[PDB]
Scaffold this active site. Structure first.
Site, short mmCIF file in Angstrom:
data_model
loop_
_atom_site.label_atom_id
_atom_site.label_comp_id
_atom_site.label_asym_id
_atom_site.label_seq_id
_atom_site.Cartn_x
_atom_site.Cartn_y
_atom_site.Cartn_z
N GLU A 152 -24.63 10.09 -31.75
CA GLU A 152 -24.85 11.25 -32.59
C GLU A 152 -26.16 11.96 -32.29
OE1 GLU A 152 -23.97 11.38 -36.87
OE2 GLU A 152 -23.05 9.34 -36.64
N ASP A 153 -26.20 13.25 -32.60
CA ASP A 153 -27.37 14.06 -32.39
C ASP A 153 -28.35 13.94 -33.55
OD1 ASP A 153 -24.88 16.23 -31.30
OD2 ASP A 153 -26.30 15.28 -29.93
N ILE A 154 -27.84 14.09 -34.77
CA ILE A 154 -28.69 14.09 -35.95
C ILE A 154 -27.95 13.59 -37.18
CG2 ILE A 154 -28.14 16.44 -36.68
CD1 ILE A 154 -31.03 16.78 -37.55
N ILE A 155 -28.67 12.91 -38.07
CA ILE A 155 -28.10 12.48 -39.34
C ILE A 155 -28.82 13.13 -40.51
CG2 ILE A 155 -27.57 10.53 -40.83
CD1 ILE A 155 -27.31 8.79 -38.39
N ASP A 156 -28.05 13.75 -41.39
CA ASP A 156 -28.60 14.47 -42.52
C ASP A 156 -27.97 13.91 -43.78
OD1 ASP A 156 -29.41 16.19 -44.49
OD2 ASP A 156 -28.70 18.02 -43.50
N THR A 157 -26.73 14.33 -44.04
CA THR A 157 -26.00 13.89 -45.23
C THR A 157 -25.26 12.57 -45.01
OG1 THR A 157 -23.87 15.01 -44.86
CG2 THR A 157 -25.67 16.34 -45.76
N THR A 168 -20.84 13.07 -41.16
CA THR A 168 -20.36 13.01 -39.78
C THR A 168 -20.26 11.54 -39.34
OG1 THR A 168 -21.45 15.12 -39.32
CG2 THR A 168 -20.61 13.88 -37.45
N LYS A 190 -32.82 12.56 -40.48
CA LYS A 190 -33.63 13.35 -41.39
C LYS A 190 -33.99 12.55 -42.63
CE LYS A 190 -32.61 18.27 -40.79
NZ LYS A 190 -32.35 19.51 -41.57
N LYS A 231 -36.60 19.38 -42.36
CA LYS A 231 -36.75 20.74 -41.85
C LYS A 231 -35.59 21.06 -40.92
CE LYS A 231 -40.68 21.70 -43.80
NZ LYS A 231 -40.52 22.23 -45.19
N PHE A 232 -35.23 22.33 -40.80
CA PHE A 232 -34.13 22.70 -39.92
C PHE A 232 -34.59 22.83 -38.47
CE2 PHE A 232 -30.40 24.85 -38.32
CZ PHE A 232 -29.38 24.29 -39.07
N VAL A 233 -34.01 22.03 -37.59
CA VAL A 233 -34.52 21.90 -36.23
C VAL A 233 -33.54 22.39 -35.19
CG1 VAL A 233 -36.18 20.06 -36.60
CG2 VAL A 233 -33.75 19.53 -36.33
N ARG A 265 -30.24 26.72 -26.58
CA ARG A 265 -29.76 25.73 -25.63
C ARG A 265 -30.77 25.56 -24.50
NH1 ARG A 265 -24.30 24.19 -26.86
NH2 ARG A 265 -23.34 25.84 -28.15
O1 LIG Z 1 -31.87 20.40 -38.67
C1 LIG Z 1 -30.61 20.72 -38.26
N1 LIG Z 1 -30.42 21.53 -37.19
C2 LIG Z 1 -29.19 21.85 -36.78
N2 LIG Z 1 -28.10 21.39 -37.42
C3 LIG Z 1 -28.23 20.58 -38.50
C4 LIG Z 1 -29.50 20.23 -38.93
N3 LIG Z 1 -29.36 19.43 -40.01
C5 LIG Z 1 -28.03 19.28 -40.23
N4 LIG Z 1 -27.35 19.98 -39.30
C6 LIG Z 1 -25.88 20.07 -39.22
C7 LIG Z 1 -25.31 19.24 -38.08
O2 LIG Z 1 -25.50 17.84 -38.30
C8 LIG Z 1 -25.05 17.39 -39.59
C9 LIG Z 1 -25.23 15.88 -39.68
P1 LIG Z 1 -24.51 15.22 -41.21
O3 LIG Z 1 -25.02 16.11 -42.31
O4 LIG Z 1 -25.05 13.81 -41.30
O5 LIG Z 1 -23.02 15.28 -40.97
#
Ligand SMILES: O=c1[nH]cnc2c1ncn2CCOCCP(=O)(O)O
Ligand SMILES: O=c1[nH]cnc2c1ncn2CCOCCP(=O)(O)O
Ligand SMILES: O=c1[nH]cnc2c1ncn2CCOCCP(=O)(O)O
Ligand SMILES: O=c1[nH]cnc2c1ncn2CCOCCP(=O)(O)O
Lengths: 213, 212, 213, 212
Positions: free
Chosen positions: A129-134, A137, A161, A181-183, A195
């Site tokens: 995975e690229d990033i974890i927020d909520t 995914t 995050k 923060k939004f990255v 990109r």
């Molecule tokens: O900081 C972000 N930059 C770009 N896309 C982002 C960022 N934070 C959340 N997203 C949405 C894509 O990744 C969501 C991961 P999830 O919320 O764990 O499913």
């Protein structure tokens, strides 16, 4: 468990004029958080860790459209370790497509999956995975693989995050724990832009507005 | 231009001249294309691509069989060039996943085909790692063109010099190579040679050791 | 002994429009002989070879002003091998300055040397060279090191030209054996130009004239 | 600007977070600057250099103590930028070799000093890997300036935050770091850590193991 490299809320990242950034992004960013080469080095230690655990066998699972960049690099480093094995080790790359949509009402999360995952049964599977927020995914990718009865399951994510985690499956390998923060940059675009930006940076308001949708 | 032509004459390179993993000491004949040579050529291809498709949006469509190493590298070089543009140029990257069957390569079986109609009215670069008989591509061109793109170009790392070829020629060729079965860089063999950097002709004892 | 990668007189190298070359060198070259990345890969195998022989201990000797580029890369690859040793291995880098001047009359060769070479006694010394043509630079470097009574002596050279060798000390490690053509790029400049050229190419007549002296 | 400031507060990085050779597991405290971070900063420094000295000839003068890794990398980035110029810009690269003595760093002993008068009337960039008390540089500046260059700028990868400092400040700083003894990347320790990519604080058991 190993929270990864921790970039704390307190005075986060680096001032923009300290690293090389495309001129056409001069106004579209606030700070730089993780320079490219820093991502590389960490990703390198990460590949070492993966092999510690995995390696019976290994099926590296890439999440399509978005996650190709980090997958590519992570796998390049792993391939690099494998060159020294006394026996050649088969690794199988696998793919799911996965898209998300803004929920708008309700809260209710929208996930559109993947296809053909026969090569999962009784193998060791890494979710990349690229990033974890909520965490959705990840949660989605989790129950999806458990559905094909593998032997072992781990999650690697470059970014985690520091946010309201609902409760789930805490990632096994974390590259960087970063502020709320939004990255953009490296693996994360914004409506097709950034990109060509190698570093993880915070998008500014000028950037958000300019890069429409 | 048919790309970097590697002759039938004196094939490629003696194995001991380059760095290859010990576990493949036995599984190869020659090195056709060392990794760095691939990179250098690819850097140029990326430049050729921008000359003809630059400024405009462009949808980079990767033909995804077993890997996308080449795709990955081509796009890094393209992104590297785009770092300089006055205006930021948005690049749409997508994949079209093919699964293998049947001897009869022309019959494609697409799996990963989300909104193929995103292609409509856009500038598509189709990226492929090797072209052999040319059947896969020409019937993939048929599929794509029905979604009426504004323009389709094709870029292949390797075009094989074969009688079995139906004559399809990509718009961008990395290397024109001899009619021999190659592995490495982007071409795996039943999950093997993934860690091999170079394009090398597979030996018969390697063909047996790793065969499905 | 291992002539290195042989680039033969017959139809040598690649057409210019096939690789990435700086626009400001569009007219200053004839063909490209060895693309950068090709130099890298070969240099990599070369570092492996060096360790085969050397390694008691090793003093890598760099030839100053000119030879820093190839030395840098060759040593980067060696450092890369050393990371895996079970014991940390001390390598000592050493330096000689060495300049040549056109002979004009006579034939008589002009060599201006180096200084402080105490760190040579009883060690394993590698001479690192960019290119071999007449063999004099090598011959000069040879008798100079034999003067400080080392244990072992080897010559690595990225390039060996196919020319009238007078008779001497045939190099131990050769990167590429190339035609009798004047080459610039990578490690070989021409009156301060071509440093930004990564590939070994043949300088053209337009280039020679334009890049004066 | 004092470059990338690494605080006295929370030093650098936990050792297990990055890839370090097994033989140094014991010989370090922290990672201050991972290799790639050095590269990324250096890429920027190279850009800053061209902004102020570009177009003009410039003589890149490397202060050569034990190695020139940093010099090498800075110059690759500079050459990478120069690839784009309309006109080819000739770059003169030279070295000034220093040998070590005496506690008293200000006393320089130049060995490799061919035609120091080549510097006369030229634009000199002096490249150094670490600045500590600042004595070496300031007395090296004295030497150089006597050959009356048109202009002298100084570029240091590392400037150490010390009371022992006489206040000399380079024109280009890679990183301002805590007053601790560091090894790696370009700084060897009695011939050791040459294979260490990163800037790391040397441990006491490493200080003993490798000491002269
Ligand atoms: O900081 C972000 N930059 C770009 N896309 C982002 C960022 N934070 C959340 N997203 C949405 C894509 O990744 C969501 C991961 P999830 O919320 O764990 O499913
Ligand atoms: O030389 C080859 N190495 C690896 N895979 C190969 C090779 N030759 C053919 N293939 C299979 C995939 O290429 C077929 C594409 P098409 O034959 O142009 O439809
Ligand atoms: O092809 C060349 N390009 C640039 N410099 C060259 C070339 N051939 C010879 N030189 C002069 C520098 O190297 C001389 C090696 P030696 O003649 O063995 O001492
Ligand atoms: O932290 C250090 N690592 C390696 N070498 C070091 C360090 N600190 C001082 N040195 C010795 C070379 O630096 C001295 C230059 P000056 O003290 O500015 O004259």
């Amino acid at each position: 468990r190993s929270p990864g490299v921790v970039i704390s809320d307190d005075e986060p990242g680096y001032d923009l004029d300290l690293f090389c950034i495309p001129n056409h992004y001069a106004e579209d960013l606030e700070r730089v958080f993780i320079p490219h080469g820093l991502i590389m080095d960490r990703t390198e230690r990460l590949a070492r860790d993966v092999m510690k655990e995995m390696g019976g066998h290994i099926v590296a699972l890439c999440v399509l459209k978005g996650g190709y960049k980090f997958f590519a690099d992570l796998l390049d480093y792993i391939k690099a370790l494998n060159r020294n094995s006394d026996r050649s080790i088969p690794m199988t790359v696998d793919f799911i497509r996965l898209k998300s949509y803004c929920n708008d009402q309700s809260t209710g999360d929208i996930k559109v999956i993947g296809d053909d995952l026969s090569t999962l049964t009784g193998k060791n599977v890494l979710i990349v995975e690229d990033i974890i927020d909520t965490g959705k995914t990840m949660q989605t990718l989790l129950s999806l693989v458990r559905q094909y009865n593998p032997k072992m399951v781990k999650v690697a994510s470059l970014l985690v995050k520091r946010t309201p985690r609902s409760v789930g499956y805490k990632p096994d390998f974390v590259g960087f724990e970063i502020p709320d923060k939004f990255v953009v940059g490296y693996a994360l675009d914004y409506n097709e832009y950034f990109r060509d930006l190698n570093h993880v940076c915070v998008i500014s308001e000028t950037g958000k507005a300019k890069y429409k949708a």
